């Protein structure tokens, strides 16, 4: 809610002024934040997937969805419908709380943080970033890590351009290099 309140009170006014929008509905909102773990090694052992899910659950606060292979792929030795990943979709209050926890805590705790890339937009105002270790989230205990395990965050936006996209995140002081 902190950053949701900050969005409504402060960010909307910045983006209105910046882009000279007619309507307030023309301002970029943050739609959702999808955390994904590709757990391709789980073909060997399903316990790793369970542990991966448990980590993503701790980070997010939601029980994750176990994703599965859209098709068989011989390169990675996966058949169709084999569980090879897991995701959480964060929307609303939980999204904003996570987005706080990411910016204020987790991103600082990245090893050798020199800003996030500003060229990591899809072309349609959505931002994606790799987390390389689950240690950056304090929710994970450092002691009980079986394997070091990253996840990809994606912040989906109602921004049309990347300029609108980056401006929105920049208004939250999203740490861009």
């Amino acid at each position: 809610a902190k950053l949701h309140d900050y969005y409504k009170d402060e960010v909307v006014k910045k983006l209105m002024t910046e882009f000279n929008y007619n309507s307030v509905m023309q301002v970029p909102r943050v739609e959702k934040i999808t955390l994904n773990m590709g757990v391709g090694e789980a073909i060997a052992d399903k316990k790793l997937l369970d542990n991966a899910a448990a980590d993503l659950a701790a980070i997010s606060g939601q029980k994750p969805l176990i994703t599965k292979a859209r098709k068989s792929v011989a390169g990675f030795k996966i058949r169709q419908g084999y569980p090879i990943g897991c995701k959480v979709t964060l929307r609303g209050e939980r999204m904003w709380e996570f987005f706080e926890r990411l910016i204020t805590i987790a991103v600082p705790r990245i090893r050798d943080f020199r800003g996030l890339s500003a060229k990591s937009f899809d072309g349609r105002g959505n931002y994606s970033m790799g987390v390389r270790e689950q240690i950056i989230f304090p929710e994970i205990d450092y002691d009980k890590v079986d394997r070091v395990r990253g996840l990809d965050i994606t912040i989906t936006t109602t921004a049309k351009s990347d300029e609108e996209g980056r401006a929105l995140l920049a208004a939250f002081d999203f740490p861009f290099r």
């Binding site: 705790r109 090893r111 050798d112 020199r114 240690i135």
Partner: protein
């Protein structure tokens, strides 16, 4: 127990625990602790939160971890881009400090690859 963006060991004496920081050896580890005013035999587990914070301030006086790693990486990249002798040695993966390559030099050359 978390200093310089790493989790240092808790059960170890502080002198040893600090050396887990990249850029901190035995001599610095002693200077850090002596500046912070912590006895070397103290286990990091036994320290209070304020004592950890003083150590973080003391460690911050030294170029460590990613600051150091990029200093080193730059210093090597500098040489390789110059095309100085040491540069060429770094590129080819051969001893840089004038050691013999007729024999030994396996640390640089890696395991032997037969003809």
């Amino acid at each position: 127990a978390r200093i310089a963006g790493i989790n240092i060991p808790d059960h170890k004496h502080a002198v040893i625990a600090l050396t887990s920081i990249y850029g901190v050896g035995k001599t610095r580890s002693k200077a850090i602790l002596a500046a912070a005013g912590i006895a070397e035999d103290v286990k990091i587990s036994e320290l209070s939160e304020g004592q950890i914070d003083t150590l973080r301030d003391e460690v911050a006086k030294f170029v460590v971890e990613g600051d150091l790693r990029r200093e080193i990486s730059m210093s090597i990249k500098r040489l390789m881009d110059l095309g100085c002798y040491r540069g060429l040695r770094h590129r080819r993966g051969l001893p840089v400090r004038g050691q013999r390559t007729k024999t030994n030099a396996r640390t640089r050359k890696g395991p032997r690859k037969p003809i």
